[PDB]
Amino acid sequence: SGFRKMAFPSGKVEGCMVQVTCGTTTLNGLWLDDVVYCPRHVICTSEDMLNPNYEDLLIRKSNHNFLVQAGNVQLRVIGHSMQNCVLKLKVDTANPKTPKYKFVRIQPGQTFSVLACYNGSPSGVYQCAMRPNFTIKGSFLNGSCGSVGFNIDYDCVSFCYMHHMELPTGVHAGTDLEGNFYGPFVDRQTAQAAGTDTTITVNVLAWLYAAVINGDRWFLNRFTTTLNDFNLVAMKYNYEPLTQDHVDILGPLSAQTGIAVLDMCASLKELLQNGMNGRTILGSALLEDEFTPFDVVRQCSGVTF
Amino acid sequence: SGFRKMAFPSGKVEGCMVQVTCGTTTLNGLWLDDVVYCPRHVICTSEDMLNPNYEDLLIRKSNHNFLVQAGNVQLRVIGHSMQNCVLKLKVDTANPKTPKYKFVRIQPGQTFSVLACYNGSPSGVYQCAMRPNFTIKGSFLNGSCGSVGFNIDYDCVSFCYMHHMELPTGVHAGTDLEGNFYGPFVDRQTAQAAGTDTTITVNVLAWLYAAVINGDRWFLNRFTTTLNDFNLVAMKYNYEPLTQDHVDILGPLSAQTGIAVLDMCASLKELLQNGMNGRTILGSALLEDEFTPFDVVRQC
């Protein structure tokens, strides 16, 4: 029993974290095989970050300008190239701790674990979701740029995020491992604002199934709804539309608990129009939207890595 | 900026997780140097779960009765001893991934990361607090016994918990790494109930200071209170008494935010009386009590 946020074990990723220093800027890099990946803004100064020409700044750099440190060992950079907003530093040594890995771009609503680092040293691990507005509600201080988000699939690490910046509202923005930003963001000091966020509906439904599996049933009701009537209500409360794919994905949880997806939707609809009435679900007074249907199944069944 | 419930990186602990099998029971063990630690109830049969005599069951066991598996490699048990509720299996190979470590017993209110394992394989990492009633609100299934709780404060792993059992209310009970249970619990299937839980007051105050550091000030008020008047109110809401030690511990946060501890205590009294009124603090509609003052300073 019990339901907790829970991140993937971070060991496979910790063996990849290195410190990347260029001039006065020090941030984190991901060392996989003979390449170190990090945000390209490491090559920037204060004048540069206002309006940067990364191709021009990078062409003026030499390999010895990048100081890469793996533990107490300095790696030597033998090449440098840029792919979108990520900088690739070729090193002479392949990381002996390189796990089986893949670079994957995730969709809003999908979850991943963040290994927060400072000076190439992992300090914490937390689970979060790619918000529908493409920000993440992370926890990051200065020097955490280059910290990565990942998932584990069997013995394979899927790297899906690298931290680049913090928006004025305290939310975070970053890229996949190919340097492509999640969201309408750019890697420079300029006026940027995250769009109005929405609730990840399929994730709330998955978390309601997790609550039923844990014995919390007070919110269940006799009612069912059409997908169209539910979505008309969902749109109204700033909730993401629920697609037929989401309904299909909730299938195993629906089969396990005996509560059809549209029946759980009718519980969610009443919960939105009426509230919790001083009650809690899994110790929470708010509907949790950072557990996907796969996360709920994995945790309420014990899949290991 | 931002505030998250955050576990320590689990890598140093993952390299220590092994599978321990005795008869039909299979659970997790912690392999440090040439010793594998695990709950002593791994030696228990169906007949010996209500009133097991562990000294008697252990004396009937031999080293070849314990099957230890580290990855796909079977370790050879060359000795067995019991320390309180923990079983120590001496092995013929020292763990090459053994980190710098210590065994520490924690106090209620203290937080730690849990590496949940099944069959010696880590499946997830999460954050816990030792509840005032000495239980933990974990997320554990059958097979998770021997999963450990730890803190990694600079380089060294402090092992503070080993999972042993689930109580009828879905909460969890376990021991430190010397086999001493946290709480009035025994490793028997006898009728056991956790005491009524209470909110860890000092941790709620630390989390209110974290919210002020992050710019959330709506709950602040112009009131202060005496420690005694605060404790009289807080206890009516099943909150733990706040001692002078707790007030002293909140000192750096008080100095950083400019809000005296007794002033923040008055904001806490107001919150308990009014509720949140549809507002949230750090994205939460409830008062969070699983961030200690040390956690808040570290994360901020």
Ligand SMILES: CN1CC[C@@H](C(=O)Nc2cncc3ccccc23)c2cc(Cl)ccc21
């Ligand atoms: C009654 N019983 C069963 C096996 C084991 C037990 O509770 N272990 C389990 C661990 N973590 C979550 C669980 C979730 C569902 C079931 C078991 C769980 C145990 C251990 C002791 Cl020391 C005494 C009794 C006892």
Ligand SMILES: [Cl-]
């Ligand atoms: Cl949690």
